[PDB]
Design an enzyme around this catalytic site. Structure first.
Site, PDB file in Angstrom:
ATOM      1  N   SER A  55       0.826  -1.233   0.000  1.00  0.00           N
ATOM      2  CA  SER A  55       0.000   0.000   0.000  1.00  0.00           C
ATOM      3  C   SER A  55       0.851   1.270   0.000  1.00  0.00           C
ATOM      4  O   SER A  55       0.304   2.331  -0.327  1.00  0.00           O
ATOM      5  CB  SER A  55      -0.962   0.012   1.150  1.00  0.00           C
ATOM      6  N   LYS A  64       0.484   3.361  -3.013  1.00  0.00           N
ATOM      7  CA  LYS A  64      -0.584   4.393  -3.095  1.00  0.00           C
ATOM      8  C   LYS A  64       0.029   5.792  -3.068  1.00  0.00           C
ATOM      9  O   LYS A  64      -0.606   6.717  -3.589  1.00  0.00           O
ATOM     10  CB  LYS A  64      -1.603   4.223  -1.966  1.00  0.00           C
ATOM     11  N   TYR A  93     -11.222   2.290   3.576  1.00  0.00           N
ATOM     12  CA  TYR A  93      -9.898   2.057   2.955  1.00  0.00           C
ATOM     13  C   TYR A  93     -10.086   0.992   1.870  1.00  0.00           C
ATOM     14  O   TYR A  93     -10.634  -0.095   2.186  1.00  0.00           O
ATOM     15  CB  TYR A  93      -8.894   1.654   4.035  1.00  0.00           C
ATOM     16  N   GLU A 136      -1.119   9.581   5.222  1.00  0.00           N
ATOM     17  CA  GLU A 136      -1.829   9.959   6.463  1.00  0.00           C
ATOM     18  C   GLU A 136      -1.037  11.085   7.124  1.00  0.00           C
ATOM     19  O   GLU A 136       0.202  11.018   7.120  1.00  0.00           O
ATOM     20  CB  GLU A 136      -1.963   8.748   7.381  1.00  0.00           C
ATOM     21  N   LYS A 153       2.751   6.118   6.223  1.00  0.00           N
ATOM     22  CA  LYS A 153       1.956   5.120   5.479  1.00  0.00           C
ATOM     23  C   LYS A 153       2.565   3.753   5.759  1.00  0.00           C
ATOM     24  O   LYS A 153       3.806   3.629   5.686  1.00  0.00           O
ATOM     25  CB  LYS A 153       1.964   5.449   3.984  1.00  0.00           C
ATOM     26  N   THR A 154       1.715   2.791   6.095  1.00  0.00           N
ATOM     27  CA  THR A 154       2.062   1.356   6.178  1.00  0.00           C
ATOM     28  C   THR A 154       1.749   0.711   4.835  1.00  0.00           C
ATOM     29  O   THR A 154       0.894   1.240   4.081  1.00  0.00           O
ATOM     30  CB  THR A 154       1.295   0.642   7.293  1.00  0.00           C
ATOM     31  N   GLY A 155       2.432  -0.392   4.550  1.00  0.00           N
ATOM     32  CA  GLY A 155       2.190  -1.205   3.349  1.00  0.00           C
ATOM     33  C   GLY A 155       2.405  -2.664   3.664  1.00  0.00           C
ATOM     34  O   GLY A 155       3.354  -2.983   4.392  1.00  0.00           O
TER      35      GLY A 155
HETATM   36  B1  KAS Z   1      -2.154  -1.935   1.796  1.00  0.00           B
HETATM   37  O1  KAS Z   1      -0.936  -2.862   1.690  1.00  0.00           O
HETATM   38  C1  KAS Z   1      -3.531  -2.664   1.440  1.00  0.00           C
HETATM   39  N1  KAS Z   1      -3.401  -4.105   1.452  1.00  0.00           N
HETATM   40  C2  KAS Z   1      -2.933  -5.023   2.298  1.00  0.00           C
HETATM   41  C3  KAS Z   1      -3.105  -6.289   1.690  1.00  0.00           C
HETATM   42  C4  KAS Z   1      -2.728  -7.616   2.265  1.00  0.00           C
HETATM   43  C5  KAS Z   1      -2.275  -7.723   3.577  1.00  0.00           C
HETATM   44  C6  KAS Z   1      -1.942  -8.946   4.138  1.00  0.00           C
HETATM   45  C7  KAS Z   1      -2.037 -10.083   3.366  1.00  0.00           C
HETATM   46  C8  KAS Z   1      -2.481  -9.990   2.048  1.00  0.00           C
HETATM   47  C9  KAS Z   1      -2.564 -11.240   1.216  1.00  0.00           C
HETATM   48  O2  KAS Z   1      -2.355 -12.338   1.798  1.00  0.00           O
HETATM   49  O3  KAS Z   1      -2.486 -11.112  -0.032  1.00  0.00           O
HETATM   50  C10 KAS Z   1      -2.818  -8.754   1.490  1.00  0.00           C
HETATM   51  N2  KAS Z   1      -3.691  -6.144   0.476  1.00  0.00           N
HETATM   52  N3  KAS Z   1      -3.858  -4.776   0.352  1.00  0.00           N
HETATM   53  O4  KAS Z   1      -2.295  -1.353   3.094  1.00  0.00           O
HETATM   54  P1  KAS Z   1      -2.223  -1.621   4.658  1.00  0.00           P
HETATM   55  O5  KAS Z   1      -2.908  -2.942   4.958  1.00  0.00           O
HETATM   56  O6  KAS Z   1      -2.975  -0.469   5.282  1.00  0.00           O
HETATM   57  O7  KAS Z   1      -0.800  -1.579   5.169  1.00  0.00           O
END
Ligand code: KAS
Length: 358
Positions: free
Chosen positions: A64, A67, A150, A272, A312-314
């Site tokens: 994320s 983004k 979100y 954020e 921002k976290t991802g």
């Molecule tokens: B983004 O990275 C939105 N986000 C998270 C995920 C995700 C998280 C954990 C596992 C999996 C999976 O197994 O594919 C996917 N997909 N999209 O933001 P955040 O979560 O706010 O850091």
């Protein structure tokens, strides 16, 4: 009488290094930028089976944090007069003209306030035709603009429209325009065959090697991969936009503007934003299950703070990311891991390090 590089290394060793043992994380890259000096700290393995060490060339999935590049691209398009944030997607994606989703503006898509878009597309949606059908068949639920949920589809559609407005596919907008404008040399939507040796494996919760699956509008939502040196350059651009050409400078400043509040969290474009100084609990609250996974009524900004910080976290299946910067202290931090650890541990480690540095 200890050099600055060694003090930062000691703080990162104290706060980040213990998370590798605690959560069984194979590899981690931690970067700090202070007063235009960059510090790079690498731990463990990019690939367990290949015994390849994490290094300055290691490519991580940003999830994320992708983004933030989508937001920067939108800011670039807006300030070049290619889009207005008051436009609706039907102006650019003609097949969406006069559909219910054409009642939602680009800013509301970018900031997750359509009122009926969840975190993920339905599992069945994969092809471009299936994505188009999904948005053509879309109907409102909550009043448009009032509720933050979100959403990958939401900023995904914003990305797709930004790309249409610049007459290029989204991958080319980033790889040919935005990444080069930001001076990024090793940042990809699609990692080419010649760099696959530098592409880390992700590790799932059973420490099995995994990489991100292709998905609908994946690139603008969670599809960017980058190195620690590139992510430190991205933080540098966000700390010093005045040093960049007008077009990307205005793009970056556009992503820093708070659009609405959810308690103490200000939603900017991708970023954020928080009043600085921020308490640890304020930053932890931003990534609670309630804010991340459920709808929240938004409020107009009623106290605009003088001094702000941004994060921002991802996350992908196999990777965790955290980026944070504080313009007033001219400081930022990047954390990249090839295994997810709890968001709260990323935020807390970064908080202690950035507050302790001299
Ligand atoms: B983004 O990275 C939105 N986000 C998270 C995920 C995700 C998280 C954990 C596992 C999996 C999976 O197994 O594919 C996917 N997909 N999209 O933001 P955040 O979560 O706010 O850091």
């Amino acid at each position: 009488n200890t050099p600055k590089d060694q003090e930062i290394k000691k703080l990162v060793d104290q706060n980040f290094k213990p998370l590798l043992e605690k959560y069984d994380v194979p590899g981690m890259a931690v970067g700090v930028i202070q007063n235009n000096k960059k510090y790079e700290m690498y731990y463990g393995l990019q690939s367990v089976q290949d015994k390849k060490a994490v290094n300055s060339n290691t490519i991580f999935e940003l999830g994320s944090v992708s983004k933030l590049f989508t937001a920067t691209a939108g800011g670039y398009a807006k300030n070049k007069g290619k889009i207005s944030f008051d436009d609706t997607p039907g102006k650019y994606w003609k097949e969406l003209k006069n559909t219910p989703i054409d009642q939602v503006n680009l800013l509301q898509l970018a900031t997750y306030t359509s009122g009926n878009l969840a975190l993920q597309f339905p599992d069945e949606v994969q092809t471009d035709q299936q994505v188009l059908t999904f948005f053509k068949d879309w109907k409102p639920k909550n009043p448009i603009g009032e509720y933050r949920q979100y959403s990958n589809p939401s900023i995904g559609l914003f990305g797709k429209v930004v790309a249409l407005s610049m007459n290029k596919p989204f991958d080319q907008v980033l790889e040919k325009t935005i990444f080069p404008a930001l001076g990024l040399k090793h940042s990809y939507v699609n990692v080419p065959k010649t760099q696959m040796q530098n592409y880390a494996f992700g590790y799932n919760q059973e420490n099995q090697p995994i990489r991100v699956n292709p998905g609908p509008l994946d690139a603008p939502a969670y599809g960017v991969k980058s190195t620690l040196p590139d992510m430190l350059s991205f933080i540098h651009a966000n700390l010093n936009p005045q040093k960049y050409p007008t077009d990307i400078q205005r793009a970056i400043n556009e992503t820093h503007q708070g659009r609405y509040q959810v308690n103490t969290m200000y939603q900017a474009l991708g970023w954020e934003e928080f009043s600085y100084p921020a308490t640890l609990q304020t930053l932890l609250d931003s990534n609670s299950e309630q804010i991340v996974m459920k709808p929240n009524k938004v409020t107009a900004i009623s106290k605009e703070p003088s001094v702000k910080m941004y994060h921002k976290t991802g996350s992908t299946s196999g990777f965790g990311t955290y980026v944070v910067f504080i313009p007033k202290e001219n400081i930022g931090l990047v954390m990249l891991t090839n295994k997810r650890i709890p968001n709260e541990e990323r935020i807390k480690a970064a908080y202690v390090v950035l507050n302790a540095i001299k």
